[PDB]
Each structure stands twice: as C-alpha cells, then as structure tokens.
Subunit: 149 residues, 6 copies
C-alpha cells in the first residue's frame, strides 16, 4: 500500500550542504514528500527519540550529538518506502555500503553517516508520531497514474 | 551581513519535483538555510501574504492558487540574499528571465513560475514574521571563514 | 563484437521527464546511438511486438498500456550493450533493483518500471528489425580509439 | 498559445555526447516533445533546408556540414518556445553568448555551435513541416495544469 | 587560436569542494587542459604573483590569503580562453556576476570569490611562465575537428 | 585512519572529459585531495609503475598505453580510501562492474577502463613514492569534525 517512512538528515549532512541532493534522490525516485521541517533537536526530545536505547552505553553520546546541529526532519510515501529508503541509504558503515547509495557516496564514518531511516513500518509509524504530532501535508501528484498502477 | 530573505517553492514547484534541485542551488551558493517547512496554506493566510495586492483583479486566482497544493516555505541568510536571491530566481515572466536563473531554466508561464523570493529586506522581515512567527533555527557553518571575510 | 540492443523508454518515462536522463546514461557509458524516434505506437504493432506472449493472460494489458502514451524507441551499439543495458536498467521489480540502476533510482512499481531493454542478442536483433525496419544511422565517433581496445 | 519550434542537435553536438544534456534542458524547462529522430541528412534535403541561403558564399559550407554526421531533429512545444529556444541556445558566436545558454557553456566556434533552433514562428512552422512531413506525436502531460493556466 | 589562460582555484575554492565542479565547466566547454597542479603557495612566490600590486595597501592581505591553503593552478587552451574564462568566471563581486557564472552560483563575497583568471592575453602569458616554468602537457583532442575548424 | 591512495585518471579519461566528474566524486565523498598533476608519462617511468607485470605478455601494450596520453595523477586521503577507492572504481572489466561504479558508468573495455587505483595500502605507498617523490600538499578541511569522529 501507501506506507510512510521517517527520513532524517543529520547535523553532518546539513553542515556539508547535502540537503538538496538527498531530497532530490527521493523526489526522482517517485516517492512523495509528506513532511519536512528544519530544526534544532532539544535534549528532552532527543532522549525521546533514542528511547529504545536508553539502556545502552552509547545513548548519552547519541543524545549529545544530535543536539549539536540542526537537522532536517522528513516523511516520505509510497510502495516500500521503508525498505527502499534503507536500501537507498546504504549500509551503516559507509565503507560497507554499496556504491549508488547515499552513504557510499557521501559518508566516511559510521558516526557521521549523514542520514537516518526508519528500519521498519512500525518504527516508522512511531517515529512519525514523535516528530510530526501536528500531522502531515495532504496532496496527490498528477503523475501518480504514471508512477503506480 | 546576516541579511535574510524568505524563499518559497510554490505548489507547482512541489508537483514538478524541483524541491531538492532548488535547495541545492542555494546551498552550493553558500547561503545558510535558517528556516524550512512543508505545508498546506490556509485561505486567510494566503490573503494576508498577498495583502499588498488585495486591490488588484488577479488577487482571487493568486490565493486559490497558493492553496491548490502544499509549498515549501524557507528562509535563507547571507550577504545580499534578498537581492541576489531575486537575481537567481529570474524575472517574473519566465520568457524574460535571464538564462541561468531558476525561472528561465524551469518555468514557462507567470502563474506557474516555480518559486517566490522577497524583493526587499523590509518585505523580507515582513514575510519572515508572517511565515515564521516561531523563529529560525540557529547554527554556525564550518565553511563560514572560507565563505566570508 | 558490436551488438545492438533495443532500448525503449516507456510511456511513464516520457511523462516523468526522464528522456534526457536516460539517454545521457548511454552516451556517457560510451555506447553509440544508432536509432531514435519519438512515436505513438499503434495496436497492431503493439501486438506484434508483444506477440511473443499473445497467449498469456496479461497480454491485453501490455498492448493497451504501450499505446496509452508516446514512447522513445532507440538502438544502441557497443560491447555487451544487450547484457549491460539490462544491468543498467536493473531488475524488473524496482524494490529489488540495485542502487545505481535506472529502475532502482526512478521507479516504484513493475507496471511503471520506466524502460525496456532487449534481453538477449537474438531478441535484440528481432526488435531492431521490428521497430527500425528502415535501418539505422551510420556514423563514426571520433572517440572510438579511446573507448575501445 | 502553444507554438512549436524546430530544434536540431548539429553533427558536432552528437559527437561530443550532448544529446542527453540538451534534451534534459528542454524537458526540465517544461516544454513538450512532439517529434524527435536521430538521422543522416542527404545533400538534396540539406539543400532544401538552407535554400533560403543558396545565394550566399557560405552556402556550400553549410550543406557540406549537415551531411558530415547524423543530427537529432526535434520539435518542441511551449509558450514562446521559438524565442526562448533562441535565448536558450545562445548567440551565434559562442564567445558572445550569455552564460547559462547552451552555446556559452558547450561551444567554442560558430562553425561548431552545437545546436540550432527556429528563428521565428513562421520559420518554425516551415522547418517543422519540412523535417516532419509525417506529422507529430500527440500526448498530454499530466503535469500540464502545473505548468500552465 | 591556441590562446592560453592561467586559471586558479583559490584556497576557499578547495575547502568548499569545488575543484571538480569548476574543471567540469572548462571541460564541457571544449577547452583543452594543458596544465594542472595542487600546491601550497610559498610567500616569496605569492609576492611574485602579486608583484604588479606590490605597492598597494591590500598587497599583504592578498599575499597572506593565497598562502593559507592549497590551490589548484591550471592552464586552459582554446579560442578566446582568456576573455571567455573571464566571462565564465564572472564579475569580481559575486553579487554582480551574471547568473550562470562561477561566482554567481558559488561565491558570496569578493575576498572569497573562489577562482582567478588571467585578464589579458599578455597577462596570461606572464602568469603561465610564472607558475609553469617547467612547461605544459602535450596532446591532441580527438574531438578537435568537432569543436574547431 | 588517514591512509592514502594513488588514484589515476588514465589517458582515455582525459580525452573523454571525465576529469571534473571523477574528481567531484571523491570531493563529494568526503575524501581529501592531497596531490594532483596533469602530466605526460615517460616510457622508462611507465615501465617501473607496471614493474609487477613486466614478466607478463601484455606489459608492452600496458606501457605504450599510459604513455600515449597525458594523465592526472592524484593522492587522496581518508579512512579506507584504498578499499573504497577500488569499490567506487569498480571491477577492472566494465561489464562485471557493479552499477553505480565509475567503470560500470563510463567504461566499456578493459584496455580503456578509464581509471586506476591502489589495490592495497602498501601498493599505495609504492605508487605515492614513485609518482609523488616531492611530497604532498598539506591542509585541513574545515568540515573535518563533520566527516570523522
């Protein structure tokens, strides 16, 4: 069906002027932008985001890091956006990702691997609920009949 | 200096998959993205945003059109952003636009000229106050010393 | 040797403004363009082409779809054009296509997977005779001694 | 209204690998393709096309040049295609063309200025019926209401 | 004719990842690359490069700057390289350069306008003798007959 | 850590105008340019670079080749630059090359596979020593904290 995924451009990806590039890959892919906002993640909120790892050792670092620079919060839609978004993004380790993927092309180190994507439809539904409580933008592309069906 | 300009991708700009292409253009330039959000414009809001034309005949169409689809409302900061911002977008009429400018390269008609840019710093602040009453994200690019001074 | 493959940009490819992107992919690879035409396919022809499976169920669909809009018929020459072209196009299912392939980067569904490419040297030769019974355009790229040997 | 213009990628444009670049420029602008074909030109035809200059010293030169290699004949349609097609192509002399224009960024001499478009609507119609006596392929872009009205 | 012009990507040009971008502009143009090196400028040399201004108040700043980071020194050949280089590059002040030029799309301030280009055939000759005393690379482009004659 | 790799644009890469495109990839990836020089190779020199293949029958054609056109020799730095360098370049035989790799995208035959890159780090050192005996350019990107750590 029309599932959605949460895609986030991290601090490093912003400092290195990669926003347009990332958004262009998803645009030409046929997926639909449903939500986008550029903003400074706050501590409390960041802990909320990395809550499923509050137990873990690297949690504090995660929180601290994402607070260091504004990020771009997105939500895209279409057949297999969660899984394809992951595929498009590439391996966690840049030197492991496949050429053609975002991380294989723009990243060098795991800790600065430019982007983030929901690893599942449910985690996506949860992430979307946390970042876009206000809801998303409604619209339908006039090219829909040529992308689907 | 720290001059800011309100740049917005009109609805037709979003339908034709030009979001990332436009954003890359202001990034590669060296301007800083200070605010961004993907939304659906409300009729009362559109009216205000076009207040300085309420008197003109084409007002209705202008508002009905601004609401026909979601847009990308942004704020870019940088030395002369308003002026060059307007220079980059190109003349109102596409066919009169200088080759190399956005409108000349991606548009055909005036009522569908992909994007809008503040035309004075005063109107800039007037628009920023309207679209971003909540304020702008703050950050400091590491390329700043190589872009300024 | 100098095989030729029949590459056709499907109706959706034309609507999604991907004609240039696609052709720039084959030109840059070093392949030679031998034939190219923008045309509206007629049913009898649509049927001959897909006749390889006029028996099957979905046959009707394929015929009706390739006539719903204009296409871009092309012929490309070079070493391993047939095989490499399919490699460049990517697997039938976009969601299975590898990053870097056309389908992986521009498509979402199989019904709208943007492009067709000969699947074997024989089929390639037969399609070239079907779509270009008038012959190809003979020319000698000055870049030959630099892409061959 | 939606006039049309004859756009041709000269022999040099084909050799240099610019068929893709050029097409994409026009697709991106928002013009619609109505007819395109890769082909060799016979002397007879080349003479009809430049008949208007038969009484000029440089006439032989022109005829002898369009026959040296295949070209790419195209008919593009859009508001003001002819005049903006001219502005897009750039001045006759590459060194006098405006940046952004096709000749300013891709050519060096007048004899090898890569592309050529109709200079007037009357001259366009004429070149269109001469190169495409067999007619043009009709189709309506689903993106029409976002490019016009 | 076989004119040459010294083209330099200044320190800020390297720090901003523009090397490939700039080069592609001269490559796609049809111009021939005759020399290129990535180097750190030693003070004594900078003083020699800026000698003709050795009596101006901003001389020390001009020297200090060019020493603060590596640069890419190049030599390009082609009809009207000097002046056309000046055109491609753009007006001294980025905010005054024509859209389509390097400074118009990549720079914000004059003191960091990303690149330098000889201003006259005689100056280019000096500049070349100063940075490339060791001579230039020799080659003939196969596409020569398609960009010249 | 901060390993280096010798990356060379072969003679056919220059003739084909891929210098800018290729360099832009490494810059966009986040690797650091440490050395670069457009140059003509001397026979006795080529013989030593291909020393490890002097026993083989194709050594002669191997040397006569890089000696027939100027090349661009470079040293790049970054974590895993050798491994990623090879991955980005792609299998030595273009038709086995993974989509998204420089060779899978720009090459056709082995003898004209566009680019060369260290296959191990100790060979990188062999090459850096041979081609860059005078040393490399030193500098520190301002985006360092956003690429590593």
């Amino acid at each position: 069906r029309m599932e959605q995924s949460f895609i986030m451009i991290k601090p490093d990806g912003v400092q290195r002027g990669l926003i347009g590039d990332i958004i262009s890959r998803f645009e030409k892919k046929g997926f639909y932008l449903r939500g986008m906002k550029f903003m400074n993640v706050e501590r409390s909120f960041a802990q909320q985001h990395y809550a499923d790892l509050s137990d873990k050792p690297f949690f504090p670092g995660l929180v601290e890091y994402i607070i260091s620079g504004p990020v771009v919060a997105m939500v895209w839609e279409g057949k297999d956006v969660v899984a394809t978004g992951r595929r498009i993004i590439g391996a966690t380790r840049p030197w492991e990702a496949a050429p053609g993927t975002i991380r294989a092309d723009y990243a060098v180190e795991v800790g600065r691997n430019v982007i983030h994507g929901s690893d599942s439809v449910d985690n996506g539904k949860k992430e979307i609920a946390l970042w876009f409580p206000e809801g998303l933008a409604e619209w339908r592309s006039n090219l829909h009949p040529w992308i689907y069906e």
